[model samples]
Target chain A: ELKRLKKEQEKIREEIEEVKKEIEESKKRESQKNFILSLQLFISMLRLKLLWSRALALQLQRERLTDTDEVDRRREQELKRLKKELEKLREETEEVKKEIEESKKRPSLKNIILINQLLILVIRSEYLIIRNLISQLQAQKQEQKRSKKEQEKIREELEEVKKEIEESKKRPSAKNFILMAQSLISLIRLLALITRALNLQLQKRLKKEVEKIREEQEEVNKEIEESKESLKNFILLAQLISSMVRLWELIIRILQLQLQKEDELREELKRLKKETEKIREETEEVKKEIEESKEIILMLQLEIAWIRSLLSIIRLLKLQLEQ
Target chain B: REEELKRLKKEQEKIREEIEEVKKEIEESKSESQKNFILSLQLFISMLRLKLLWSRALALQLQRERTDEVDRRREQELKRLKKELEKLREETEEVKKEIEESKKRPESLKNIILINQLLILVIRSEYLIIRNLISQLQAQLKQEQKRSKKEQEKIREELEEVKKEIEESKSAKNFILMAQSLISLIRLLALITRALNLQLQAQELKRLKKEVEKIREEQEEVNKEIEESKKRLKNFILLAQLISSMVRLWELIIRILQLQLQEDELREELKRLKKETEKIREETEEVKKEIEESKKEIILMLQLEIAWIRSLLSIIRLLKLQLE
Candidate 1:
């Protein structure tokens, strides 16, 4: 009976030990499962962190690429616009050059000089002609003065002849009284015929002298008309010279205005130069700002790279933990 | 059985202590992560601010480009005016030289009439040029006014958007309040600048008005002279009248030059305004520096948090190895 009871107790002890061993194994399994579960949770969190970081990196890259592209596009457009403007300016310059060449071809300095020489020669010749005309006019006036003196002398001779005729007529009546009566009658008749012939000849001579004086008067009238026409030409020439002088004054005034305008333009150009220099300085500042931004972007890229490396290290850590 | 029960109770107590310690560690990690989250939020806000700054910089650059375009257009106009002036000057020089040559020799009546015609044309062109310059200046001033109005409108809209953004950010109250204060200061400065610009514009307008009145008086006098000249028939009388007209034109040109000087002064004022804007930019740069410092601090905290997390992970790995 004692042996059987001891064997039974030993069997109970063995069963108890087996049960305790099983409980320990189950607790170990549970603890192991809890560790795995916690590790999984940690790995999932790491994966999410990596995903978020990668998304952030992608977003940053996209933003940076977009920004760079936008800037590049704007710069390209600006370059295109500048190129077009340069081309336009070149075309304008070419046009201006063509116009200048054409203008130069049309009226060279030599041509102007030759034209001036021709004009001077023409003026000198005209002056000579005017002097000749004046000399001719003086000669005509002298001739007219001499002709007037001759006419006065002819008039005086005519008056003296008329007085002589009147005296001869008064003396002729006394000589005829004492001729004999009969012979005197025949001689008186003959004398009367001779007086008639003498009267006809003297009238013929007077008619010839009057015709010569009339011809002299007609010639003098023609000379006066010619001198009046020459005077009119001289007056026209004087008026033309006055007009030319007026034009010369106007030209001088215009030249003064042009010089004033040139001065104003020069001042404006100075202002423009200053403005351009200011613009250049501003552009330099902009360039520096752009470089600063680029540096900032580079720093951001490096940071993103660091984040990616950290994510990779976290992934390796996660793999080791899973293992 | 009693001993086993006592030993189990002791073991249970030890396990409870270990669990409490783990709980404490978890709470500490949670607090650290929370700090990391707050720092990340600050970084996000800073990024938004950076974006705003970038947008502002772009806007400023665009405005500069617009101003450059306007200046380039003005330069082109000036160049064109210079070219025309040069051409006219050259023509006048040629006419003057021709007149000098004609003075020596006295050319024909035909040439004299031609020169008279050319002089008339030149006078007419000069008058037209003066008129054109006046009209162009007036147009440019009007355009400038319109552009200034538009720019002011744009600035106002930007300010409104900034205000809206500040209002939307309620989480960082203190920071937003600081931003608001800074923006208000900027607004006040802008208002002062606007007031000064308006005052300057008003003064310029008044000066222009006075100049216009003077020009009008001169114009009336020129008109009277023209009437008197029309009544005169003699060439010398006309010449005297034309000389008087030239004098009036000279006065007009002087007035125009005064206007140009005023424009230059306005440009100087604009330069002064740009300097003020640069001062404002410097202030903004100071704010940017503060933000950068905060960002650096946030980054350092984040790195420390990451290191803590790595240490925790390493301890977990060591425990797992011991268990294995």
Candidate 2:
């Protein structure tokens, strides 16, 4: 039994030696694992430093790009003032236009005065010419009536002279050789009768001619007075005509000037229109260029965002490994 | 009991085999030594053969000390010779005493017995020495087994440590490669940053340009309005020209009236026209006001526009600076 115990002890000792050798081998393996882990950890720490440094740099760049507060605030304030002023200007323009329209509708006596004056001038001249022509025609008609009455008086005188000559012939034939005293008396009486009759006829004819000439003169004066009574009506008509003509010319001049001004406005407007169109086209082209750039910018932004997020991922992984 | 006898016989067989091998080696060495002596005795025959035989004899003599069995035999022979010499001295002394009387008894058998005893003593001492050496060798063999076990364990442990170091070296190389790859990733990030920076530059320029153009358009509109107002002012000038001529005609008409009757009649007629003309004069006043208001408004608009344009110009300059 003692021999058996010695043999068993020997076997146990052999087993213990094997176990110790195995333990030493495992210890070596553990040391190797630790060495590798430390080496990897060193590299990871370097990578973390790189990521943190890049994060700090990127944050600085973003801050610089985003901050322009002084300039932006000033620009914004100016824009706000412009907006307010523009709105106020619009209201003012509206009010001015409204007042102008109201004034156009209902007031201003000067324009009416100018127009009426022009009417009075043109019409008054035409009425004055008509009155002068009527007066000349009535004076010519009275002269023609006086000349006809003088012609009738001359005819009556000629007939009376012929009757006197026939009576003288009869007296001379009856006075032959019968009483020298009675015949001498009859001859003397006949001679005296012819002379007195001629005198009476001349006086009556001249008196009737004078009365007819006086009656025609009175009729001519009545016609002249009748035309003179309507002097105001004719003068007023010519004055109004002249005034209206002047007003028309004035209005025409105004219209021509207005058209000229419109022309000038149109000329400028056309030029401005052309310029604006060119500017608009240029702006459109620039906008198109911007659109093309937008795609690239968008893609770059996405990649940058992803790249930034990668550091976060790395940090999370680092935390987990540490845990 | 039969198994035990069999085990003893096997042990006897093993021991006999070991003794036979040892006896064979002894015989081989003895024969080699004899051959060397015989070769040396023929040294006077050929000069080269004599030198070669001399060296062979010298090597054989060295073998006597080098070979354990031969060396032990030689020591035993020397001890025996010494014993024989010592015994010969004592016998000689007795023989010498007999020789003085000239009557000596011859003891050849005693001499032979003494020679045999000396040989026996030398043989016994050699045997005891051989047994002592065998016991020491057995103890040494046991010690050698234990040492072999310890050495094998030590060598195995050393090999395991070497393998561990090799693995650690390989792991260190792997970690260095990971660091290199991490540096490469940092380069990739730099490339990404550059690309994004260029794109950002383009976008900012585009946005700024849009704002620049907006103010330009606003100024354009104001310019158009100014042009319209100027047109109205031009029209008013023409209307004023016509008014001057008409005023001349009225002056001439007023002078034409002189007599009392004519003055009274003209006054009545003028009153009638003045009623209507008054309204026209009022209209002129309002139109004159329109002209004034329009011109003033235009001036104001231009002033405001110019102000904005100058500001816009400044902004453009700033933009240029930013771009630079």
Candidate 3:
């Protein structure tokens, strides 16, 4: 039993070690998950900033346009309209969250509780049986050891009687023979008396051991019942925890789904960023046009001034001709 | 045996409590992720909204700026027109002063002078109005900037809140197994949880792969707009330069007329001046033809710019589609 218990302990220790190793591996995975989440957020934020800056740049360029064209006016209207839609989407997001929460309402625990109780009962029953068996075996071992000790003493006494009988044979006159017979008979009587007393004492001890065994059995039964009660309580907690863990798993799944949605949003933001860059470039081109227009106007002014000088020269010539 | 069983039961209870704590944590985490997801979506959308608001503000600013530009340009045009009218009046006065010196012109010229004077008076008031509009637009521009800047602070605040939300979401993940898992308990929970996460990742990877394919397609679409805009810009610059040169040529003709029509020389001067006048007429006709050429070219360039703007708007529209 000791050997078996040692083996079981080793098995449990090995299981525990294996579990720790697995936990270690999972810890690494969790850490990776954490980093991945952060990276995703970082990338998302980066894209948002990109889009924001681009949009701002685009707006700055367009605002700089001397002529805010019809197309841009319409584009601005669309942007405002989209902003309203985004605001509405926030409400929708709240609703989505509500729905998710509602779906996570309390789960039933009755079946789980029952199954857990049954498993605990079985385990405790096995434990109690092992204990009872060990106790019974121990009691029997003690009884046998006592019996062996008694038998050894009895054997030693019987040897002494035999030696006494051998000495009696060396003195074989009739009286001595008679005395020997009487002594032998008396020795037999004494042996029988001692045996009877020993038997009575052994019977009394056996009766007491039986009573002790009975008491131990009852104590074991009480312990079994008490353990069964503790087991019931433990079983309930285990079932409760088990269901909670399962619920936790369910939540994890939901979180993963939500993360997936976030990824989709991130992708959307990315595309928006690309478009923002394009818009910015277009505004820059418009800005270029304004720059060109400015040059054109300057040249026009130069031409006008040159023409005015020529006109002045013409007036001088005409006046001189008149003179 | 009883004590051992009791200890086992206690151990079991401890495990159960640990698991229970983990469950609560995971539940809290679920809600955390939910909140995070919603918060992230809101943050992105808020950024988008803020962008839209900025654009709107800028657009509103642009309108003011547009009017500012228009009023300024018109003011300049009016000034130039006024000066041209004033010069015409001066020439009319010179002609009147010379009318007694030589009756080469008629009373119709006097009437033309009167009309020119009247038009100048009308444009002076219009110039005042243009100035008024410009001052008003500048004031409005200032007010709008202040308003937009204020709104920008609000947007920045929203961004900070989003940052905090993201940080909280990060904190939320740390809560998963905080005090809940024993080595064995964690091992079991981790096995199951990891399997789920791996399952999720599998789907996510597939989705991401598909997304990558779509993004590749979008990248090609995104490459097209700017190149064409650059092409249009270069063409526009060229066309503007060409118009400028045409103006230069017209000025050159005037300079030639000025040089040829000097009056202090002789009777030969009168003779050369008349021919010079004919040359002026011919050059003026050529300049008219050049104006026609330049007009069509400018119109074409304007069309190209419009097309470029349309392409830009198309890109904007596509982005809007993606965003919405």
Candidate 4:
């Protein structure tokens, strides 16, 4: 019975040793499982982080691209509007320049024609007045010649009366003397009447000639005054032409300025177009980068999937190990 | 028999104490694992915050790029406009000098009158154009303000959502729930970045409005100058009035041109900010690589540990079977 009791105690100690070994193994397994679970949690968290980062990057890129597209569209539209406006301004300036030239030409031509007509009228009036003065001088010269001939006739008649008086002295008698005295008295009275009448006629003719000459002189003075007025008008027209020339110069300057502005606008448009082209190139680059990022994301996804499969296999092993 | 029973009871008590010690050690290991898990969670949360900060930095960089481009274009435009204005002022000065010379000629009175009329017409036309520009600027300012207000409201709402998501993440009991909350927070961060970009645009718009207002005031001052010139004309002061008026206009235009210089400093500041963001991005990339390498190493180590434990468990099972 003692030996049997000893054997039983030995068997119980051996059982205790086996149970302790089992407990230690179970504890180690539980700790390993816990470590696996924690690792799994960490990996999942990493995966979530990668996925979130990729999503954020993609979203940010999308937003940036959208904004770029909107800005580019607006810039293009604004440039187009500005170009249209510049073109319109150029056309309007050209039209204005053409109108100014036309106005300058048309008014100058009219003024020239009007001035020529006025000068012709002045010359014609002066010519008519000179001709009238020459005709009046010729008529006065003819009247003077006729009066000289009449004076010569009168002088001869006086010489004949002196010879008749000498013949009456040679016939000397009382009755003859009485007849001679009567005839002589009648001849003397006739001579006195003719002289008085000739003097009156000469005086009236001289006064009339003087009055006509004076009237011609007054008309010439009036014509001279009119010519002075025309000269003053010509001076005023010259001044107006000078002013017009200055105006034309100003217009030319303005047109040149407008042309320069147009050139500047064209250059600005070209630069804007270049900038747009550069933006397009940048956009293409961005698209390429996005594509590359997508490939990387795809690689990351495959890797995550691979990791998940490995985790599953590990889990299966864990289950098998437990069984 | 009683002696044998006493020794068996002592042995049973010793075995019970050893079992309690084993239990205590297991509990300690469990607590340690719980601490490690919490530490990992904390690392993940810090990583999430770092990622959020990185995204914000990227968004800020993008905004800076846009604003820099806009500022550069605007600066060029302002410079060009200043040059044009200077040329106009010079031209006007030449015209004024010509008028002064022409005044010496008595016969040029009519011409002087005509020129004065032309100048007045030009001045009035310029004033009208300035008024039109002012009105357009005002309208633009109003529109910008409205857009800014709307963006501010959106930013506020997005920030609130982000806060709520953060709270949810903090309260989460499981890894999956925490991850879900983290994802939601990331989405909210993206929204917040967009809102921040809008806010920056709004700030730029506000600055632009201030510039417009200043320009409007300058225009008002120009109007006053023109009015003074008109009054001088009424007094029949021709050449002096024109010269003074033109000089005043030139000065005002110069002042406007000077305003363009102020923005150059802002551009410099933007360039500095861009450099800082670039540096931040480079650092973030390095940190990201480090985290990735650590994760990979940790995963490999955990896998090896698991495999070793599994093999030991298998060996223990075989031993137990042999014993049975």
Candidate 5:
């Protein structure tokens, strides 16, 4: 079980290292690759640029033939048209970035998400690693304190050697040699301590940087999420505005039906007005024969009253429609 | 006799100085190599750190849903090596101390002269350092080999491009074919123009002279175009040749590196494999012993059960034999 966990830890560490290498390698290599690709693209475009110069040179040559023969002029015009087409092609090619821009839209978004995700994971891992490093550093610091005690003990040995070297003649030169050996031992200990200290410092720095990177990655993720949300909102708002327009159309349809109804009522009123004029004309002629036309005049008066009542009802209904 | 002893001591001092000088030179040389190795590792680690902060990862079973594997096993191996080397160093320290005790002999008497330091212990410590330092160097070399393999991939692509171009060059390899094609195209236009040039002259001699001038001018333009086309074709052929040669050279270099790496890997692999084989043999023998012990245990258990069975059985030898 212990061995299995070690293997797992090793695997995780490997992944982190792999990601680091990949991103850095890609960044460095692609920077160079893009530079080369850019150069190649420029050279391809240089061919088009040369073609432009050639066209201008050809135009100059044509113009030099001032006493233009009709056939020669016709041929020159044809060449000019072909040259125009070529210019259009060149312009199109120059605007080739449009194709790249269009092509990149969806795929680049995906890549951005991919890269951002990778960046996030890396940052999180780094943060976790840095935190681990920090905690380890704290432990290392404590361990260093303990090691310093060992170092101090070694220093004491050096001091003891100094005393021995001073009394070297009393105990013969062998004691002096022993003291030198003691000094050398202390030197080795001190050197090892210094190297470990340097390593600890470097590890501490890397851990701090990892923390910084994690923060930056989170910021990137936040921006992406925000932008995505805005896009969704824009699409939803557009749908809402379309529905509002449909609502307005539906209202217009209702108004149309009312307008048609009003037109039908107006037509009926006009017909009634025409009939009243004809009735008045009949009543005037019949006035001479009042005794014979009395009943008909009375009936016409009644019919006018009925028409007034109907018009009153239509006015009330129009007022209600307005409300 | 005292004077001779003094002279001998002086000569020894001189030899000792020379040895010191040689040791200094060796130390300088070793330090330089070591510094270079360490510097390379530092640079690699720096780049790797930048990348890690720059990129990231995901889950296992969930990974099956993802189609793009983009295998990263080789990269992870670098980190694994670093960790392994570190752990191995710590684990071997105790062993170093043990050996220092076991190897104490007359050297201990000499070492007593330098009693503050244990030369043996220092040597053991330094040996471990040098080993680890070499481990770092080997890691970088291994990385370079992987990079070389990738470079070989690019070279192969360039080779394909070279091949395609070589084929294209073969089809239109000749300037004459191109010129012939161009001349025919011009001839069609020139024939009609030649008639028009003839119409421009009232006298036969003047007309002939003008016609000759026009013909020569048109011919010059045709030749100029042909030459330009030829020059471009030649440049393409030169490019193909340059890349093909470069590819061939890269291929040879890659093969050499591959062979070197293979030799190194095989040496290490075989050593480890041999150790593993020995270990397995030992383990199998141990397992065989365990199996034999288990068989005895089963037999003993059966004997006890059989005694009980015999006591329970009817008093018939034939029945007892059948039961057995």
Candidate 6:
């Protein structure tokens, strides 16, 4: 009995260990799942940021390009203006020169000399003014060129930024894995627990009934044996036996009947043991059935995951156009 | 011996009846034990089934985890590639801008060439006018010199005539008139010489004046041209200034836009990094939650097992008591 107690203790300890293992495994699995999910979420956020950044970069690049275009346009306008100015100046110079030549053909002595001197002074002054104007125009053109260069530089930088954004957008980052792993771990643990519970309940019920049956068998065996010893001590049975010794045939026949009854009961008990064996076999068969079913379920679950992935892909694609 | 036999027979009879009852009870006990055994077997089967179920569930979980990780990695890679593509696109735009700038260079050079041509025309016109003025001055000088020579010869001829007339007359009135005529001829010759000198001075002065007038006229014309040029230049300058101002504004605007874009990109990058970190944190939290729940469930299950074992032990103890 003490050894049996020890054995029972061992069994209990083993059960405890199994439960502990389950818990530990579940914790680990859950943690891993959570980590995966978090990683995925983070990756998604990174992608979103990249997308937004890329968009902004493109917009900015466009703006910079536009500005550069404006600068180029202004420079072109300025160049055109310069051309017109130069042309106009040339015309005026020609007209003035013709007038001077006509005046020179016939020398005029009356008051024309003073007028001519005055005109010459005016022309010289005007020439100087034109020169100044041309100088100023050249400066402006230079400034415009510089501005265009600056605009181009900025736009180029924007292009670089757009590239970065595009790269970021392409990459995806853990949530899906995390959730799936965590859920699976949880489910495994739950199944383990439920299975354990059913086993324990069955064990308890079986133990209780077996004990009661064995006890009743012990009681009945003791009562019947004790009663037979009491009956053997009766004086009436002795008188019958003494007289019956002369006619032993009858006594033997009675003894044989009693022995036959005992044989019948013993045989019945043996039959019950056979029944127990049959029950055990049936129980084992049931256990195998459950195991087989569980395996099938596992396979189904695996298929579920694959289908889920396809579903998620479709769903994600659908949301592509959304904000 | 017969008494013993009778006693044995009676004992056998009693024992047999008791045995029969005991056998019936034992059979009932056997039936009950079978029930117990069946229950235990059922329980064991159920436990095995549950373990199998748990294992299956665990395997599914593992598969799911694996697949999820694979998907995430794939997505990440794709996103990275796409971003690279975008960068390439931007580079292409830069090339376009460069091409535009290159186109502008030749146009600006053309404008400079035009200005040079205009300047050359003006200089040539001025040169031609100057040459014509010089020729006119030279012709006037030649005419003045010829006139002076003619005047001198006439004056000499008149003096000789007057001298002869005075010498032939010989009367006082004749001589006085002849002498006076000679004197007048001599004065007339002096007058002619002075007139020639005056004429030369006047012609030289006139030539100087004409040249001055020509130059003055040229100057005036040049001045008018200059003034017109200045006006046109002023207008060009105004237009150029407008263009430059617009260009400058555009340039500044572009610069600001670039800055903003850069900042946004940087900010987004930072956000992405942060989000990535957050993903780890979230996954950790999820793991923690699962661990906790599993712990509770296992604990509960263990407790239930304990209860079941206790009941089983009690039943076993009852058997021992009955046996004793």
Q: What is the C-alpha lDDT profile of model 6 across B13-96, one tens digit per residue? A: 333333234334433543222333222222222222222222222222222333355445444433443353334334334333
What TM-score does chain A reach in every model?
0.14, 0.14, 0.17, 0.15, 0.19, 0.18
Interface root mean square deviation per prediction: 54.3, 43.0, 21.9, 43.0, 36.3, 63.6
Evaluated on chain A only, model 1 obtains a TM-score of 0.14
lDDT of each: 0.32, 0.29, 0.30, 0.31, 0.30, 0.30
TM-score of chain B of 5: 0.17
- Candidate 1 residue-wise lDDT, A206-241, digit = tens: 334334433443343343234333223222222222
Instruction: Give model 1's docking category.
Output: incorrect
Model 3: clashing residue pairs?
Answer: none
- At residue A31, what lDDT does model 1 achieve? 26
Model 1 — TM-score against the truth? Answer: 0.15
User: Tens digit of lDDT per residue, candidate 1, span B1-324?
Assistant: 225333433433333333334334433553233433332222222222222222222222232233356445454444544454444434444444544444454312322223232332323233233323323432445454344445545555655554554433321222332243333333332332233234335433333333333333334433343444444313222222323333332333233333433355465434443443334334333333333444323343333322222222222222222121
Q: What tens digits encode model 5's per-residue C-alpha lDDT throughout B1-324?
A: 325333432433333333334334433543223333222222222222221211111111112222233235424533544564344335334333433343353232221112111211222222232233233333334443333234334433533343333323322323323322222222222222223223222233333233333333334343344344534424222222222222222222222222223254555434443343334334333323433444322332223222212211111111112111
Best by TM-score: 1
Question: How many pairs of residues collide in model 3?
Answer: 0
Between 2 and 6, whose TM-score is larger? Answer: 6
Where in model 4 is the C-alpha error above 4 Å?
A1-323, B1-264, B295-324
DockQ, each predicted model: 0.00, 0.00, 0.00, 0.00, 0.00, 0.00
Question: In model 3, which runs have C-alpha deviations exceeding 4 angstroms?
Answer: A1-29, A66-68, A77-323, B1-324
The numbered model that scores best in lDDT is 1
Q: Please state the Cα-based DockQ of model 5 relative to the true two-chain complex.
A: 0.00
Per residue, candidate 6 scores C-alpha lDDT tens digits across A259-323 of 34435644544443343334334333333433343312222222222222222322222222121
lDDT of 4 at B307: 26
Poorest stretch of ten by lDDT in candidate 1 chain B: B315-324
Instruction: Score residue B30 of candidate 1 by CA lDDT.
Output: 38
**Model 2 DockQ vs. reference:** 0.00
